[PDB]
Amino acid sequence: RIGYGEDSHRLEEGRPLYLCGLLIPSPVGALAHSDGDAALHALTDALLSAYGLGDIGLLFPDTDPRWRGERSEVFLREALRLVEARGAKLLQASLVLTLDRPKLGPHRKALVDSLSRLLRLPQDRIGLTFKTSEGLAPSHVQARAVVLLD
Amino acid sequence: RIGYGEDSHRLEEGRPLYLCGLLIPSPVGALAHSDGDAALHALTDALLSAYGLGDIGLLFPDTDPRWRGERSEVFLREALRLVEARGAKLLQASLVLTLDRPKLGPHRKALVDSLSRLLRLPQDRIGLTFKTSEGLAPSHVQARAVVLLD
Amino acid sequence: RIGYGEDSHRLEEGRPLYLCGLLIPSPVGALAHSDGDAALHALTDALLSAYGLGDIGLLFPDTDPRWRGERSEVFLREALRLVEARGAKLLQASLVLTLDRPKLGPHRKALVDSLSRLLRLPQDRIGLTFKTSEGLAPSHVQARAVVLLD
């Protein structure tokens, strides 16, 4: 099985930045009524998509008291739970984060370790890369993710 | 075998929106020489790409007189015709549709069914997720797709 | 094993365009401290991602005398070395190139031949499709790639 997910969030100055379940020091952060964790959102969508379960707007809306205000990791674990109940075993996750600031390189180890712990995958099965948009999207964080299961 | 494809079109008011082979209610439809069915196009390119066959610009360049107008379903099924002729069996398709308006929630089941129909795949092997552009691309519809075969 | 990678570079008028390791006659070329080869960069990242080796910003920075000034194909070959020393066997690459000008169609055979040579894959396992941004990104070249190994 395969899944593909994408997520993007406007960035505003002085908001906290969350990626891969972590708080990342940054002059900018997700402007939205989520934590705007683009990384986990794309990953979550990718998991749901692999089983035709819908997407995070459908399963985790802020109109539901279960899900409103929850950390994005909560959604991810939920999606993990759902596809495992259908037989899924997650084997690999590869994703790309695009944002003109801040620099994520110094946070590489922590981000990869977090995804490893939240996805329960070995580090060599976590494919994380960092890019800038070269000014094509200087006010947004974008994530695109592919997952492979059994 | 895997394939990856993308498509986008400018959106315009008073225009007809086709998505996944359906006519959808919106202020805007695609500004294209075709029906601008970004979902079907991305999927066609992903299929062609999985066998190195080219892309829709190549195989469907309108100048031929049996492409003018034609529905994008024609393109999709020809691509299906070609990979199966090369021994392929399509197993799964996972795509993301990006568009600020209109909202695709109310058309989700119909959209899946159609892809189920056209791709001759089971519901749980059609991974369709919907996203907004967050102001990055307010005037376009975007689709990106991955396919898995054999 | 699967890997997903992206790259995008600003296009400037008057600068040389390099795609898939080839010089492409064009009014625009990447404005980069590299050769701005979006195609090879996204492929390189996808390969590294498949083994969690990091990304080209990490492995091939211009801070490092061996990599500074080098053609992008040099990085791609090193990434192929790295994953093959981890036992990988590249099976397939599928990428999409997006740019508003120039037209890549007349160059398709050469670009595909370049990638089959560089990746050591037969042409039917090189999936290359060409798109414009429909005016969404008219000053950039964008590349997104999926790789499959073993």
Side-chain angles (χ1 to χ4, degrees), chain C residues 47-64:
Chain C
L47 284 168
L48 301 175
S49 184
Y51 273 84
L53 293 191
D55 64 48
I56 51 175
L58 176 70
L59 292 185
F60 306 113
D62 33 302
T63 47
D64 176 345

Side-chain angles (χ1 to χ4, degrees), chain A residues 92 94 108 131 134 144, chain C residues 6-7 9-10 49 55:
Chain A
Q92 185 159 213
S94 183
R108 188 170 303 267
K131 306 304 254 105
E134 289 205 9
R144 263 146 231 127
Chain C
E6 300 179 54
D7 188 37
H9 287 285
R10 182 174 281 294
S49 184
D55 64 48

Side-chain angles (χ1 to χ4, degrees), chain A residues 2 4 6 92-98 108 123-136 142-148, chain C residues 1-10 31-32 41 45-46 48-58 136-137 140 142 144 146:
Chain A
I2 201 162
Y4 180 72
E6 320 200 347
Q92 185 159 213
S94 183
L95 63 160
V96 183
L97 311 182
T98 303
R108 188 170 303 267
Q123 301 264 286
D124 64 79
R125 284 292 184 158
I126 294 311
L128 179 52
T129 63
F130 309 137
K131 306 304 254 105
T132 67
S133 68
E134 289 205 9
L136 171 55
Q142 317 166 249
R144 263 146 231 127
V146 179
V147 295
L148 176 68
Chain C
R1 295 208 177 242
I2 191 170
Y4 174 78
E6 300 179 54
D7 188 37
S8 105
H9 287 285
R10 182 174 281 294
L31 136 125
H41 292 175
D45 265 3
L48 301 175
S49 184
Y51 273 84
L53 293 191
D55 64 48
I56 51 175
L58 176 70
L136 188 32
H140 288 260
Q142 318 169 242
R144 284 166 192 116
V146 184

Side-chain angles (χ1 to χ4, degrees), chain B residues 121-145:
Chain B
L121 291 173
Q123 330 275 338
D124 72 326
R125 285 292 188 152
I126 302 288
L128 182 63
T129 68
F130 310 130
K131 317 282 329 176
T132 45
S133 67
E134 301 251 346
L136 205 42
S139 297
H140 293 257
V141 55
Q142 314 169 251
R144 294 175 183 86

Side-chain angles (χ1 to χ4, degrees), chain A residues 1-2 6 49-50 55 140, chain B residues 92 94 108 124 130 134 144:
Chain A
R1 261 179 205 265
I2 201 162
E6 320 200 347
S49 190
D55 67 43
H140 292 246
Chain B
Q92 189 161 210
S94 180
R108 187 181 302 270
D124 72 326
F130 310 130
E134 301 251 346
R144 294 175 183 86

Side-chain angles (χ1 to χ4, degrees), chain A residues 45 90 100 149:
Chain A
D45 265 358
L90 173 60
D100 290 13
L149 300 101

